[PDB]
């Protein structure tokens, strides 16, 4: 198990929209903190239980990274039991969570000083996501108190809203990159690491 490509995800050139957060998996490699520490400008760290950075060399069976981009304040909502907007209709993590979430601010990694409007977010779908789930796709939200037929009809919205393209009003509206390093351990053969 050599050094992982773990550093490529953080130093990547593309990040999918939050509603289409990328669920990548890494296995059969040792993920050290020496793989990416030369550009340590990470705004926020959180971890529940031992982390690859806490133990330089540490192995896991199933390590999966949930990668996406979201504005500043809502980064607070990436935590078990959180509710509201992003935590209810774009991403959700189990209330019994044993993993890590890493958030770092950037305003030029999206290739624009006024941010991008290509990273959308969904508001309201009726019923909120419970643990890891995804049901968000380009579609028209129907009814809610009165039925309609397509488009933005009588009491019907478009589920996806776009972030701004004008200059940001501070870090609060800047596109923070977020990678949730949720990992789990289960009975498996060894020499699998993450």
């Amino acid at each position, epitope marked *: 198990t050599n050094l992982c490509p773990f550093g490529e995800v953080f130093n990547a050139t593309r990040f*999918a929209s939050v509603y289409a957060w*990328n669920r990548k998996r*890494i296995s059969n490699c040792v993920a050290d903190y020496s793989v990416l520490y030369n550009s340590a400008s990470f705004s926020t760290f959180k971890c529940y239980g031992v982390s690859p950075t806490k133990l330089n060399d540490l192995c896991f069976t199933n390590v*999966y990274a949930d990668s996406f981009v979201i504005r500043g304040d809502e980064v607070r909502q990436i935590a078990p039991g959180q509710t509201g907007k992003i935590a209810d209709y774009n991403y959700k993590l189990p209330d019994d969570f044993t993993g890590c979430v890493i958030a770092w601010n950037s305003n030029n990694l999206d290739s624009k000083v006024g941010g991008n409007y290509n990273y959308l977010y969904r508001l309201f779908r009726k019923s909120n996501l419970k643990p890891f*789930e*995804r049901d968000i796709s380009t579609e028209i939200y129907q009814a809610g108190s009165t039925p309609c037929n397509g488009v933005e009809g009588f009491n019907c919205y478009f589920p996806l809203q776009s972030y701004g393209f004008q200059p940001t009003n501070g870090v609060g509206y800047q596109p923070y990159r977020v990678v949730v390093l949720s990992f789990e351990l289960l009975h498996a053969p060894a020499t699998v690491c993450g």
Partner: nanobody
Amino acid sequence: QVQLVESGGGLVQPGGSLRLSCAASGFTFNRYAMSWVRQAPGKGREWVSGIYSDGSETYYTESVKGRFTISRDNAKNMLYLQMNSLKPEDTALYYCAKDENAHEDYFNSGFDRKYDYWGQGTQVTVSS
């Protein structure tokens, strides 16, 4: 350019056995988890089965669980779906679909598989 060419399919009676093959070109087959989807005439897309990048694990939909087998040969960049004990409702145009992101996971439960590349597809029909 990414090419996904399907082979197999045709007319068959219920209870028979088919083998659908998908050859992938233009990208590294072994780096992406692959899926089988079916589009029935007059209905939306339904996900059939999914296989991880290295083929370590396989997942099936309840409508085909326990009788369909998804497998792959990374060396030949080949995807296989073995279909047995079919019901007439399986009639559809079958696509082998590549995943948007890579490396061995895009499905554990529910979810909505965003497929960045589709093939031309092959017609499969089950009728007595």
